[PDB]
Amino acid sequence: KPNAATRDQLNIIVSYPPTKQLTYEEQDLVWKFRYYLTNQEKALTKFLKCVNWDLPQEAKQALELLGKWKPMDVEDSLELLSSHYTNPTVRRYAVARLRQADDEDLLMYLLQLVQALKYENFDDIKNGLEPEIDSSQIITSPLPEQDLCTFLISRACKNSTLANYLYWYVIVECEDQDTQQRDPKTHEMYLNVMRRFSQALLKGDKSVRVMRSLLAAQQTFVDRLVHLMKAVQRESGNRKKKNERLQALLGDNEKMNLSDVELIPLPLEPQVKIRGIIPETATLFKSALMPAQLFFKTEDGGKYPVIFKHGDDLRQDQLILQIISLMDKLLRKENLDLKLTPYKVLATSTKHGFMQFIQSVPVAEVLDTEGSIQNFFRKYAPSENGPNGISAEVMDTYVKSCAGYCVITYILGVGDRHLDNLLLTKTGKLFHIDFGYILGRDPKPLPPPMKLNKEMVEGMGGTQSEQYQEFRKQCYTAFLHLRRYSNLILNLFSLMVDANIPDIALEPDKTVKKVQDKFRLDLSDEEAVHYMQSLIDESVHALFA
Ligand SMILES: CC(C)[C@@H]1CNC(=O)c2cc(-c3ccnc(NC(=O)C4CC4)c3)nn21
Ligand code: NA
Ligand code: NA
Numbered sequence: 021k022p023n024a025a026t027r028d029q030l031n032i033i034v035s036y037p038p039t040k041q042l043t044y045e046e047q048d049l050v051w052k053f054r055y056y057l058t059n060q061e062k063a064l065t066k067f068l069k070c071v072n073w074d075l076p077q078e079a080k081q082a083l084e085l086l087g088k089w090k091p092m093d094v095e096d097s098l099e100l101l102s103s104h105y106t107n108p109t110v111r112r113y114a115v116a117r118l119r120q121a122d123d124e125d126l127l128m129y130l131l132q133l134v135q136a137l138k139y140e141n142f143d144d145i146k147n148g149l150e151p152e153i154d155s156s157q158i159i160t161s162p163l164p165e166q167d168l169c170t171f172l173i174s175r176a177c178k179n180s181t182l183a184n185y186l187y188w189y190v191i192v193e194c195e196d197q198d199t200q201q202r203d204p205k206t207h208e209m210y211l212n213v214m215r216r217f218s219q220a221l222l223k224g225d226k227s228v229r230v231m232r233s234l235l236a237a238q239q240t241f242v243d244r245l246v247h248l249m250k251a252v253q254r255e256s257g258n259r260k261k262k263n264e265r266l267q268a269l270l271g272d273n274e275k276m277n278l279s280d281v282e283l284i285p286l287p288l289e290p291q292v293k294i295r296g297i298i299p300e301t302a303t304l305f306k307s308a309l310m311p312a313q314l315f316f317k318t319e320d321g322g323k324y325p326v327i328f329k330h331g332d333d334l335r336q337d338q339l340i341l342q343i344i345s346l347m348d349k350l351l352r353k354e355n356l357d358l359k360l361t362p363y364k365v366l367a368t369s370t371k372h373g374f375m376q377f378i379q380s381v382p383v384a385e386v387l388d389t390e391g392s393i394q395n396f397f398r399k400y401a402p403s404e405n406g407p408n409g410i411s412a413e414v415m416d417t418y419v420k421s422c423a424g425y426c427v428i429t430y431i432l433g434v435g436d437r438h439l440d441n442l443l444l445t446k447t448g449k450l451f452h453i454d455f456g457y458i459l460g461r462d463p464k465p466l467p468p469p470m471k472l473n474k475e476m477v478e479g480m481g482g483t484q485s486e487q488y489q490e491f492r493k494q495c496y497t498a499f500l501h502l503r504r505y506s507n508l509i510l511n512l513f514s515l516m517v518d519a520n521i522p523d524i525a526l527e528p529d530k531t532v533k534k535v536q537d538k539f540r541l542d543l544s545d546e547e548a549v550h551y552m553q554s555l556i557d558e559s560v561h562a563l564f565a
């Protein structure tokens with residue numbers, strides 16, 4: 021029905037990011053050719069955005085069109101679960117489309133889906149109970165029935181990994197005392213989700229009932245570890261005495277039940293089943309907050325070191341590591357493995373939680389003990405035939421992880437980057453830790469948008485090396501890949517705006533735009549490549565000037 025000119029304009033509208041507000045003219049255009057648009061699954065979110073849900077005649081027709089639309093993709097369904105959708109039929113449609121995801125993808129979204137329960141009908145949850153262009157770089161830069169609660173519990177009953185995270189994510193929401201004080205009905209809702217969850221597990225078959233007892237075992241274990249950390253952190257004396265107390269309490273299994281337990285899924289990574297904590301290798305970090313390093317004995321004879329923080333809110337780190345995990349999985353789906361280190365983070369309360377400990381050396385220590393990253397690589401991965409006398413595999417891994425983290429920390433606006441938050445493995449993996457400053461916040465004024473340093477660049481042989489050329493190519497390639505998933509990434513951030521995460525809570529209404537602006541969606545792919553190269557070029561020039 022539309023001509024080539026309106027079809028061109030409709031294509032622009034359907035192309036918009038999920039964040040873009042349609043003008044009155046665009047809404048009218050979308051609504052007029054709604055029947056024409058039923059063929060385009062990507063047009064459905066735009067159409068639903070044109071509906072005045074508070075006008076009954078309009079809602080009725082929008083729901084008829086909803087039933088006739090080419091079904092929308094999983095990633096678009098996340099937009100229908102935000103606070104901007106109340107219509108029960110729309111929200112059920114979202115779950116029906118979300119349900120086509122496999123559990124691997126669902127797990128990538130689950131932190132946000134647990135936030136989205138805030139936007140569901142709280143009575144239904146309760147009732148279920150039983151109560152620009154650089155010419156010289158053109159040629160060198162070629163282009164490459166159920167509601168949400170019922171649904172999540174249903175999938176969790178069938179998948180112990182999903183059940184693990186659903187349990188702990190909900191526990192943390194229940195313990196959020198800001199939510200308790202300021203939004204008591206939301207606190208009640210999360211309690212009811214947990215009661216619904218427990219009730220469903222108790223009704224299941226033999227292994228589903230065992231899942232309930234394993235979550236209880238984990239909760240009890242974590243409670244004991246918290247009791248231990250309180251005892252250690254209040255112990256009289258100095259650090260020697262505190263470490264001795266830490267190890268003595270861990271060694272007293274009859275008292276504390278932390279060093280010799282029947283196999284329990286590790287909350288941090290429930291695929292890993294643990295036999296207890298090794299008493300003799302546990303110590304406190306020197307940090308004044310006294311987190312502990314703890315080595316878990318695993319089912320298969322391994323050791324899994326963690327950081328257990330007590331007295332500290334891990335939720336911002338948890339979100340950032342969950343998003344880095346997602347970005348890594350999206351890049352890998354595009355067959356780009358940049359050797360990233362999305363270490364696990366799991367809050368077990370609003371004031372304690374786990375991080376996966378990655379063996380590595382802080383770059384500041386690399387420099388102080390070996391003088392440079394290349395000297396470090398030459399010491400631990402020598403290769404006579406390799407670049408600068410370093411193993412080609414290690415250098416490749418370094419260039420790739422450098423590019424991946426440059427692009428990812430740029431998108432996430434990570435600040436407070438110093439050489440003790442940058443870690444390096446002897447296999448060449450560079451990675452970032454400690455995400456207390458995100459979305460453009462920095463402890464110093466005028467943080468640069470791009471977080472590079474001379475040491476990284478010298479590590480890849482300087483700006484004229486082959487490795488540096490490959491670094492730049494990996495940067496703009498990862499950038500183009502992540503732009504292609506900007507709808508999904510932005511939809512997930514939109515679900516976090518009411519989370520009590522410090523750097524989001526500061527300006528919830530501006531949070532998603534802080535991320536969107538970094539993708540430069542106003543730029544074509546070709547323009548975006550030159551933008552990213554100007555970013556790197558300007559950053560590196562400043563380092564050496
Ligand atoms: C005092 C800490 C809690 C420190 C500060 N805040 C953090 O959030 C954090 C994350 C990590 C971390 C995560 C994964 N792996 C490592 N690995 C290493 O530290 C090896 C170099 C020795 C560190 N550390 N921190
Ligand atoms: Na299903
Ligand atoms: Na230990």
Ligand code: NA
Pocket residue numbers: 504505
């Ligand atoms: Na895609």
